Design a protein around this nucleic acid. Structure first.
Lengths: 180, 50, 139, 124
RNA sequence: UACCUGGUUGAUCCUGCCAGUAAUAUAUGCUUGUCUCAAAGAUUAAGCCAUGCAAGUCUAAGUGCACACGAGU
RNA sequence: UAUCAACUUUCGAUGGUAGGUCCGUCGCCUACCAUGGUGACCACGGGUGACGGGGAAUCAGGGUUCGAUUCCGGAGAGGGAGCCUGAGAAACGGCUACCACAUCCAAGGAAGGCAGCAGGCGCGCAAAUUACCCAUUUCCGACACGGAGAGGUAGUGACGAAAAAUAACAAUUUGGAAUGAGUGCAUCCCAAACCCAUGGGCGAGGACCCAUUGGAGGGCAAGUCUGGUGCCAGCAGCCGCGGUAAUUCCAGCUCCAAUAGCGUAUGCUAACGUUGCUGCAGUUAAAAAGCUCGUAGUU
RNA sequence: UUUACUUUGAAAAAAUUAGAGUGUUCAAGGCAGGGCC
């Protein structure tokens, strides 16, 4: 009898074929295109998409006049259009099945800061967040795997304490200054 | 018999390994493998010497 | 043909119940046999004392003296033959010492050109045999 | 810079308190001690710096804003009764005994084997 | 993802199993820089146990001459 | 599980009458009577690496396997048996015996139950600290005060799970620029301490503050590369590699799914439509009883 | 004459799972909080 949780779920799924020549390049292409650490992150976003596809799939099997499909279906749609992976015009569960892995990779924080020009390259965009620079509505984020929403997309900027923003410089800037 | 255990490993000259540079790891290793296979284009195997 | 009747749930259940016994992989895991005859008694690994160092000859069309050891288990006193996996690691085997043996690939089946050896030694003298092969854990 | 806002606020009068979520900002500080908070909070409600009590302050990631709970009492003598003993210990007073809890257990079991007034000499 | 591949032959199509593949959970091997969670003598032995602890309890209110401290705790 | 087919009662087995008994019903027990009750729709007997369930793992669907394990219910406190007290115990961190085991004796006697919390031995393939405290959570009593190894916290911890380094921006190698991990103070935190987290400060260019683990014949992503070892030593889950030009072994370089994880062994799931209800087969590959009758069952 | 079958509601513990809601910096999770003296 301990006051704990013991509730934890996995975020990735290892593929069936370990050395599928066609699959190895399709995941490696997503590595450099979005600047990912290893294949685990590819399988992670692939697993989140697989859950959303299966969640939308079981709803499409029910009748349209079912209140469970109407409520649970709209709630899934509102969350997809909230984060920006799906557009408000294509707000239907049929468009969920057409979502690809790159649709959720674009909503990644390290990619949004690259589309906004705050970073030089996609790999530097990871280090830009890894060094505690990017903030979202005065809330600084350190991990690059953050997902922004549409009501928070136009608030991605530098922190009030980062050298790239407005504040004190880094420790290397102050080190070379005192020695010169 | 059993009088020949370690024959080929004892008859092999103690050729030591060569000191090589620090290999990139993590995202940098996958970054190098990405541009070397897709971006840096020039059939042949990645390790086919001859 | 199979009985499809709506009240044949008992006939279908009892038939599949008695026909599963005709499966080799099912009958070996659901009877007293294949478990008491198994030297490990349902265990993945086992400790034992090295009794002899016997070199068994591989089967045709191969020709190589497979280096194994006659090991007597500590858990039940059974005598088995653990195969020394790596090259020259038979010299690293001490006499009358503890060795942690495990299965040899296929479960209860001889692997490769070895006639009947179905066990391999993992650790020797409370340390891994793989380290003794790679110049680690000098013992 | 450092300032409290007290987002929510309610008066209970059960313990003669004024419950409120005291939220203090720290643009360049690291969760200032409650001594500075209790002084600035007393002048806001015109109370004394000995009746305000705050707890549960953890600065979020990066820093900038620290939220916590706060309460005010009527007097310091009235605060001595309606207050946990460790919160009064965090101040300069009420240094509780720190001998042990295991030494007291073995003393109780030793005095349990002796009947009469002689058990007081056994434990001593 | 409602997936298969090697092996009987001179070669072929099959039956068919073995092996390959991926999770899962115990052990173990080597390795192991950070954070948040978290299982942990169940498996063979409900085998056997050194020491210590785990139920005692006093309020203005059943009974109050230890003077240890001075009516009262 | 039929290699358990009949089973239950000369001591209740089934039922009937009366009574006893218990809080109360009753073959619960006693006495008189009946020959009943259960059973192929699997009783009875045996086995279980059987506590049951809520659930867990894996699954297109159908399923398979697992559930000692923090919740609920039950069971037990070495094995039984019999009790005291109490509203409630057949209580064992309460007794009375016997059995098993074992401690102190001055040898007359006395006192024992860690499947409570730590710890030890043993057993093993297999599993932590004789750690800190009643603050949370609550529970118990005469109770605001006192008590709780129930619990909470910390140490050990690669069970497992979620985040996430080992560079980056530049140059054709040198410039700064950005940051902890680590390392040292306050505060916060905490019942105290601790991991953090935060404020400044001290803090990386072979940024040596450096990533290994199985591999590179096929299955199955990666070298007829280099040298010797020559059916020997070995490799290999399978097919297969060595009998003096080995793409397999004995090593380097390089390369590859990798990745702070990765191999190995075993259980189990998918693969397996190789247990087929969905959904398999029975002319010749394993297979329709030699043939017919025939109840239950099924339709 | 009454069953099997289908549909509805209460019942069919909590946790877990599915799953609405909430930016624990994200996530695993938690059942808790953005902003105006």
């Amino acid at each position: 009898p301990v006051a704990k949780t013991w509730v934890c779920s996995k975020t990735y799924v290892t593929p069936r074929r370990p050395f599928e020549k066609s699959r190895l390049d399709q995941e490696l292409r997503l590595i450099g295109e979005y600047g990912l650490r290893n294949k685990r992150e590819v399988w992670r976003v692939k697993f989140t998409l697989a859950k959303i596809r299966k969640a939308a799939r079981e709803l499409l099997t029910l009748d349209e006049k079912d209140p469970k499909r109407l409520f649970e279906g709209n709630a899934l749609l509102r969350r997809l259009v909230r984060i920006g992976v799906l557009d408000e015009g294509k707000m239907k569960l049929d468009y969920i099945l057409g979502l690809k892995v790159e649709d959720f990779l674009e909503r990644r924080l390290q990619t949004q800061v690259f589309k906004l020009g705050l970073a030089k390259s996609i790999h530097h965009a990871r280090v830009l967040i890894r060094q505690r620079h990017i903030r979202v509505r005065k809330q600084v984020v350190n991990i690059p795997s953050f997902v922004v929403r549409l009501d928070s997309q136009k608030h991605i900027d530098f922190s009030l304490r980062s050298p790239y923003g407005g504040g004190r410089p880094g420790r290397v800037k102050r080190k070379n200054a005192k020695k010169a | 018999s059993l009088a020949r255990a370690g024959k080929v490993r004892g008859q092999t000259p103690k050729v030591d390994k060569q000191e090589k540079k620090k290999k990139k790891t993590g995202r940098a290793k996958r970054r190098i493998q990405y541009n070397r296979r897709f971006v840096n284009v020039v059939k042949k195997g990645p390790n086919a010497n001859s | 043909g199979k009985c499809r009747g709506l009240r044949t749930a008992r006939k279908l259940r009892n038939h599949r119940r008695e026909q599963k016994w005709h499966d080799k992989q099912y009958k070996k895991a659901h009877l007293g046999t294949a478990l008491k005859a198994n030297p490990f008694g349902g265990a993945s690994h086992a400790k034992g004392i090295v009794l002899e160092k016997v070199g068994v000859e591989a089967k045709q069309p191969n020709s190589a003296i497979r280096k194994c050891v006659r090991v007597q288990l500590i858990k039940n006193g059974k005598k088995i033959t653990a195969f020394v996996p790596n090259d020259g690691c038979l010299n690293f085997i001490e006499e009358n010492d503890e060795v942690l043996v495990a299965g040899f690939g296929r479960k209860g089946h001889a692997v490769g050109d070895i006639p009947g050896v179905r066990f391999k030694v993992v650790k020797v003298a409370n340390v891994s045999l793989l380290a003794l092969y790679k110049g680690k854990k000098e013992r | 810079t450092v300032t409290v806002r007290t987002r929510k606020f309610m008066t209970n009068r059960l313990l003669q308190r004024k419950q409120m979520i005291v939220d203090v900002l720290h643009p360049g500080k690291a969760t200032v001690p409650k001594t500075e908070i209790r002084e600035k909070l007393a002048k806001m409600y015109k109370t004394t710096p000995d009746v305000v009590f705050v707890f549960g302050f953890k600065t979020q990631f990066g820093g900038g804003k620290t939220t916590g709970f706060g309460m005010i009492y009527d007097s310091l003598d009235y605060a001595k009764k309606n207050e946990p003993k460790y919160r009064l210990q965090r101040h300069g007073l009420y240094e509780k005994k720190k001998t042990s809890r295991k030494q007291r257990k073995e003393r109780k079991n030793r005095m349990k084997k002796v009947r009469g007034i002689k058990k007081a000499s056994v434990g001593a």
